[PDB]
Design a protein around this ligand. Structure first.
Ligand code: GTP
Ligand code: ACP
Ligand code: GDP
Ligand code: X0M
Ligand code: CA
Ligand code: CA
Ligand code: CA
Ligand code: MG
Ligand code: MG
Ligand code: MG
Lengths: 348, 53, 425, 438
């Protein structure tokens, strides 16, 4: 009889995983403070990793990789990419980014202005985006002044001015990929992705109205007037998207986009493996990751950010959550296909 | 990767590698000991007082 | 040299104490005449804990036999090992106590108590470093209950910093001699709450159920009940009588078992308990499953009705110490809802190489569980069923007691029940 | 030459002390009768091994050690054991009844009545020293004597020997080989009162030693003898610089200079490799890079924690056996390119390396196999704060209910000393966090 605790009640993903575990009749839930557990569905912030793996006779496992915040933080990611030789500053799939601390607090202010002034003189497109409350502008004076008005670290990266626009509609979008890394640091990519599309036509002559520029599911469902017009919930799945790429562009999702996505996932996760691997550790870790990509009109894929506690699409909750139990939990705590994942082999 | 202060002798050697540059007095202790000895005495007296009743 | 002084009082106390010395004397290779004839040095390593060494290599139990009637102690002196006890350590009167707590505590017992303390003082003066005392007695009678707790009160007055330990037989209507047993038990329990560090609660109904249902004894006798107590007393004292690090002495045992001074009443248990299919080998998992099973417990309290504050387990015999840790950790990790979560690692396990007589291996269980409140609830309800009509009180007011003393003992036990209740939530 | 005096307190301290001095004797060629055929100066000398051994006119080499226990059963083993001849009776001090795993009982009740006797026996050893460096104090956290009496002894030692260094070897409590529920209380009580009196403390977590014995030595159920012989190898590697010719950590003061830049953060992490089973057919001898690389594996640390998520303030490499500086630097380079070694910005990123050519000595009939080279890494990592967090958590669980507190108040301790000690640990955890996290 395996035992687990739940320390993040807001997690929709692991609320289902906990629902499935109990359904097997072989897992038992304990109070969130009972140390005698096999599996911890831990909190998001300040997870006490130092208390794991010190219970005699219990193989303990947790759904978070200590140190993965280096990849799932805006500022941390930019630093990781610029400082890690495995990724290099010349990394071609990540937008030119800079970490900017507000003046009320190293900092890449002057380095950003140098590249900014270079684009301005070269007649090139010089539209940047600041985030950490988002601002899209083509004037460096507005981007910096907006960050000074705040009090947290921000990042300024190049705004993909030539995104791939779906038709009909002429609308932006982004791609979410769920990736599961198990205790053995196998990188599993969920076969099912989701495109969070904008229901408003993309407009390059007005970054003030950010409804057609930001593809967030919450912004399209609150400030957009065409929500749910083209696809249910501004969510197009891979089957539809692949068929589109064939009818319009005469190519496949696998060839034009998915190869780059798998390459980016491997590069990011293999880079930090020596720092977060639990191979020789007194406890074991696994973690679900949410990768967000951008596709430009050249069919080039760009990495936007990595989410450490992602949510799943309503239609894909059952399949993925069950897949989490199979490869992540039962692999360490077996019970008494055609896998839904895609193993990205690599050298450990 | 620099090696400095190499000291060699018959039974070994030592050196240094640099990869990158950068109370209560005796009186007060007796008081604490006697203060705790006093709290024990008071507790035992209350116990004996209780047993005398 | 951490000597323990043993005291047995009243009929029940002397008959159970006699069997206790019978069992452990056999384990240490001591024959009825006090001569050693074992074959393992582990028998004498800690022998002086319970025995004095006389001339001629004679080992004399450090025990004091107390009663207000001669009868039972004449039987002990004529019993199997009756000749092994120091003759001067028989202290007895002639009046008896008529199952009357007041007679044992205030009148008949008061006249005899000083002479018992003289023998206790004598045994202590010859102890290199006295650990403390252990008393065997019942609570439903008059001598063991009333004079027994009077002895404890006066021993704690003369040895205030020594550990006081008792094996206390709790009365049950199903195995009862008189209707006044709840009166005598309620008066004693308050004494024990105040003046003992550890009390092993033994319920006669539990001993009866075990003999009848588990051991398949059609008509259990007091003798059969005392067989269980003997085996249990031998198990819980193995930590003291043989070399070991856990629960080595009485004070360390209390320090790990008693998180609150008044909650020091334990549920003991023993395994195996087999009827006569008695030669079958018992695996470690089976030993552990049964040892925690309510049917193997002798306080007649369901552990599933409370939570364990602390637990001490003693495994005896050549067995897989690794396999013991696995099953112990398995029981805790399979029922962690019955263990308080605010005392980390509150389940301790000790091993002993020498098994009991006639067994390849066994396990003795010592639990400090809030379920023990059920035992004091039963006694309290029986007390109140009679006290509300002042039934049978004249036996006690005739000895100079007042009704007020009963009302206070009643409230004292209900406070104890309430104290257990706050820690069960 | 400057003498060092070793003090062993409680069962853990005494049994570990017995295993260390057994190893010391085998390392220096000292026989159980105290004789040392290789010492050509009879009845005296100022050699490196004389920091730990005095000499009589008869040629006996006597440890500069005191054993203290509030109960005699453990120290009686020493009085009748193999090396009974080494010590004279003044060095072995035993009371009648122990502290019952009760810090207050060891510190106040029993400690008050035997402390002056212990200081008098230490003073006798000090009077034989022409230039005493300080003291090495061995004790457990969980025991009533190791916790309670040790802290009292340290307070007095700071009073009688103000300018003398004091190092600790402390045994961190692990339930797998523990039977006392109150050891978190004792651990935190003795850390609070000892913190200002200890210049450098090497914590050994029994949990770690236990698993190294099961994993590397293939011992299904390790005993204290197994644990202690492994611990004495690590202790030996740490004290070798004081007992042999050398230039690194030549006196107790250098331990603080090289390992403790901030006084309260004086708990270095020890990592040791290789630990090879003697029952093995015959193991492939590991290289300098392989044993060095193992110093950054959690599996061979004396305290289970993850240095990848802390910051280093200092790092010492102590090699024994066939090792030349060339190989050490080569391995260090290869490790910086693969490992996550983050130093605090106000400390240089480097390693102090000591090499003793004599390979580790193994006790005949022990569990460890003879190895051609071994290393012990001493690093001051903020990651060791995980052990304070674990410990302070268990403390909070029991103290919220005042469980077992009456045992301490009953021995004369005030309840407010609990919260006072806990607040000091909370401040200690804060110190580590300010130094390691961003
Ligand atoms: N590594 C190791 N740990 C030990 C040894 N002996 C005891 N311990 C640990 O020390 C703790 C118990 O404290 P002890 O040293 O035995 O107690 P004490 O110092 O003698 O103090 P008292 O309570 O008076 O007995 C537990 O965590 C034990 O696991 C030993 O020989 N080696
Ligand atoms: N450099 C860039 N070029 C073009 N679009 C960008 C961009 N950076 C961000 N975006 C837009 O912003 C949206 C994602 O913003 P971001 O992910 O940084 O905020 P967020 O983290 O709060 C949303 P989530 O974490 O759920 O993916 C995408 O829809 C994308 O269209
Ligand atoms: N287990 C057991 N219980 C007994 C025995 N004799 C009496 N009792 C119980 O003890 C109580 C009577 O006390 P008893 O010892 O006979 O009176 P005392 O001589 O005045 O102490 C009743 O609850 C009896 O059931 C015995 O031999 N074994
Ligand atoms: C509980 C109690 O005291 N019962 C009495 C004991 N002694 C006695 C003597 C003579 C006649 C009756 C009795 C009954
Ligand atoms: Ca009379
Ligand atoms: Ca000499
Ligand atoms: Ca000092
Ligand atoms: Mg985000
Ligand atoms: Mg009777
Ligand atoms: Mg001890």
């Amino acid at each position: 009889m395996y035992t687990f605790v739940v320390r993040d009640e807001n997690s929709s993903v692991y609320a289902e995983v906990s629902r499935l575990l109990l359904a097997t009749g072989q897992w038992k839930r304990l109070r969130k403070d009972n140390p005698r557990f096999n599996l911890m569905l831990g909190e998001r912030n300040r997870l006490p990793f130092g208390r794991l793996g010190h219970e005699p006779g219990l193989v303990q496992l947790v759904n978070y990789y200590r140190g993965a915040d280096k990849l799932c933080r805006k500022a941390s990611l930019v630093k990781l990419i610029k400082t890690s030789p495995e990724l290099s500053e010349s990394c071609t799939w990540f937008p030119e980014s800079y970490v900017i601390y507000p003046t009320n607090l190293t900092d890449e202010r002057e380095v950003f202005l140098a590249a900014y002034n270079r684009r301005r003189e070269g007649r090139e497109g010089n539209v940047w985006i600041a985030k950490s409350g988002i601002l899209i502008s083509s004037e460096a004076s507005e981007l910096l002044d907006f960050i000074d008005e705040q009090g947290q670290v921000h990042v300024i990266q190049k705004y993909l001015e030539k995104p791939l626009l779906l038709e009909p509609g002429h609308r932006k979008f982004d791609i979410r990929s769920w990736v599961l890394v198990d205790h053995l640091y196998n990188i599993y990519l969920y076969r099912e992705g989701v495109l969070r599309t904008s229901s408003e036509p993309y407009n390059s002559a007005n970054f003030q109205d950010k409804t057609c520029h930001l593809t967030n599911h919450c912004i399209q469902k609150e400030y957009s007037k065409n929500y749910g017009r083209y696809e249910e919930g501004n969510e197009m799945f891979f089957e539809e998207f692949n068929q589109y790429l064939m009818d319009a562009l005469n190519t496949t999702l696998e060839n034009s986009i998915l190869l780059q996505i798998k390459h980016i996932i491997r590069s990011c996760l293999m880079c930090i493996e020596p720092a977060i691997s639990t191979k020789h550790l007194h406890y074991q870790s696994f973690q679900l990751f949410g990768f967000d990509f951008m596709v430009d009109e050249e069919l080039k894929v760009w990495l936007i950010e990595v989410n450490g506690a992602p949510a799943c699409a309503q239609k894909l909750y059952a399949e993925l959550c069950q897949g989490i139990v199979d490869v992540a939990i039962s692999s360490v705590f077996p019970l008494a296909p055609t896998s839904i994942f895609i193993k990205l082999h690599h050298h450990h | 990767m620099e090696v400095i202060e190499l000291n060699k002798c018959t039974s070994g050697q030592s050196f240094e590698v640099i990869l990158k540059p950068p109370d209560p007095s005796l009186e007060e202790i007796q008081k604490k000991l006697e203060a705790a000895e006093e709290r024990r005495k008071y507790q035992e007296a209350e116990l004996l007082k209780h047993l005398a009743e | 040299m951490r000597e323990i002084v043993h005291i047995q009082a009243g009929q029940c106390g002397n008959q159970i104490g006699a069997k206790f010395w019978e069992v452990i004397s056999d384990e240490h290779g001591i024959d009825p005449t006090g001569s050693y004839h074992g074959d393992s040095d582990l028998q004498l390593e800690r022998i002086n804990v319970y025995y004095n060494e006389a001339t001629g290599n004679k080992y004399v139990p450090r025990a004091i036999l107390v009663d207000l009637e001669p009868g039972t102690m004449d039987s002990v002196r004529s019993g199997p090992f009756g000749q092994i006890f120091r003759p001067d350590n028989f202290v007895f009167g002639q009046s008896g106590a008529g199952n009357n707590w007041a007679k044992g505590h205030y009148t008949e017992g008061a006249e005899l108590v000083d002479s018992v303390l003289d023998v206790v003082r004598k045994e202590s003066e010859s102890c290199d470093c006295l650990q403390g005392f252990q008393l065997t007695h019942s609570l439903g009678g008059g001598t063991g209950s009333g004079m027994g707790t009077l002895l404890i009160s006066k021993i704690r007055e003369e040895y205030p910093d020594r550990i006081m330990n008792t094996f206390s037989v709790m009365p049950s209507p199903k195995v009862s001699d008189t209707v006044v047993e709840p009166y005598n038990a309620t008066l004693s329990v308050h004494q024990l709450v105040e003046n003992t560090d550890e009390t092993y609660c033994i319920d006669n109904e539990a001993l009866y159920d075990i003999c009848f249902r588990t051991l398949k004894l059609t008509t259990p006798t007091y003798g059969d009940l005392n067989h269980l107590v003997s085996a249990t007393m031998s198990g819980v004292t193995t930590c003291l009588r043989f070399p070991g690090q856990l629960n080595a002495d009485l004070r360390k045992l209390a320090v790990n078992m008693v998180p609150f001074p008044r909650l020091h009443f334990f549920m003991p248990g023993f395994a195996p308990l087999t009827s006569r299919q008695q030669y079958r080998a018992l695996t470690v998992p089976e030993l552990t499953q049964q040892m925690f099973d309510s049917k193997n417990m002798m306080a007649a309290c369901d552990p599933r009705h409370g939570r364990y504050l602390t637990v001490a387990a003693i495994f005896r015999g050549r067995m897989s110490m690794k396999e013991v840790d696995e099953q112990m950790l398995n029981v805790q990790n399979k029922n962690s809802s019955y263990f308080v979560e605010w005392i980390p690692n509150n389940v301790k396990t000790a091993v002993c190489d020498i098994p009991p007589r006639g067994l390849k291996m066994s396990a003795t269980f010592i639990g400090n569980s809030t379920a023990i409140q059920e035992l004091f609830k039963r006694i309290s309800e029986q007390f109140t069923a009679m006290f509300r009509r002042k039934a049978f009180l004249h036996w006690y007011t005739g000895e100079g007691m007042d009704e007020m003393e009963f009302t206070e003992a009643e409230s004292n036990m209900n406070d104890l029940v309430s104290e257990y209740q706050q820690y069960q939530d | 030459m400057r003498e060092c005096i070793s003090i062993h307190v409680g069962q853990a301290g005494v049994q570990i002390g017995n295993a260390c001095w057994e190893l010391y004797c085998l390392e220096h060629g000292i026989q159980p009768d105290g004789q040392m055929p290789s010492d050509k100066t009879i009845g005296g000398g100022d050699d490196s091994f004389n920091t730990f051994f005095s000499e009589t006119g008869a040629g006996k080499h006597v440890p500069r050690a005191v054993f203290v226990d509030l109960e005699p059963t453990v120290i009686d083993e020493v009085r009748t054991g193999t090396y009974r001849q080494l010590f004279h009776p003044e060095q072995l001090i035993t009371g009648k009844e122990d502290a019952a795993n009760n810090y207050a009982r060891g510190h106040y009740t029993i400690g008050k009545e035997i402390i002056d006797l212990v200081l008098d026996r230490i003073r006798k050893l000090a009077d034989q020293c022409t230039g005493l460096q300080g003291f090495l104090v061995f004790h457990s956290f969980g025991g009533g004597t190791g916790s309670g009496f040790t802290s009292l002894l340290m307070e007095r030692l700071s009073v009688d020997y103000g300018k003398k260094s004091k190092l600790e070897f402390s045994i961190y409590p692990a339930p797998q080989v523990s039977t006392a529920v109150v050891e978190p209380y004792n651990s935190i009580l003795t850390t609070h009162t000892t913190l200002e009196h200890s210049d450098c403390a090497f914590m050994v977590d029994n949990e770690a030693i236990y698993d190294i014995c099961r994993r590397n030595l293939d011992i299904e159920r390790p005993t204290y003898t197994n644990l202690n012989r492994l611990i004495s190898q690590i202790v030996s590697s740490i004290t070798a610089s004081l007992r042999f010719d050398g230039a690194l950590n030549v006196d107790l003061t250098e331990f603080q200079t090289n390992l403790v830049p901030y006084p309260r953060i004086h708990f270095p992490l020890a990592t040791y490799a290789p630990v090879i089973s003697a029952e093995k057919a015959y193991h492939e001898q590991l290289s300098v890079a392989e044993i060095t690389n193992a110093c950054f594996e959690p599996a061979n640390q004396m305290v289970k924690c993850d240095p990848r998520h802390g910051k280093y303030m200092a790092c010492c490499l102590l090699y024994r056996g066939d090792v030349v500086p060339k190989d050490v630097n080569a391995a260090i380079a290869t490790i910086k390119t693969k490992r996550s070694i983050q130093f605090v910005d106000w400390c240089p990123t480097g390693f102090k390396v000591g090499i003793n050519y004599q390979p580790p000595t193994v006790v005949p009939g022990g569990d460890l196999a003879k190895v051609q080279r071994a290393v012990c890494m001493l690093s001051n990592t903020t990651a060791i704060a995980e052990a304070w967090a674990r410990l302070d958590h268990k403390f909070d669980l029991m103290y919220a209910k005042r469980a077992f507190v009456h045992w301490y108040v009953g021995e004369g301790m005030e309840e407010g000393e609990f919260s006072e000690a806990r607040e000091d640990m909370a401040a200690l955890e804060k110190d580590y966090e300010e130094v390691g996290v961003d």
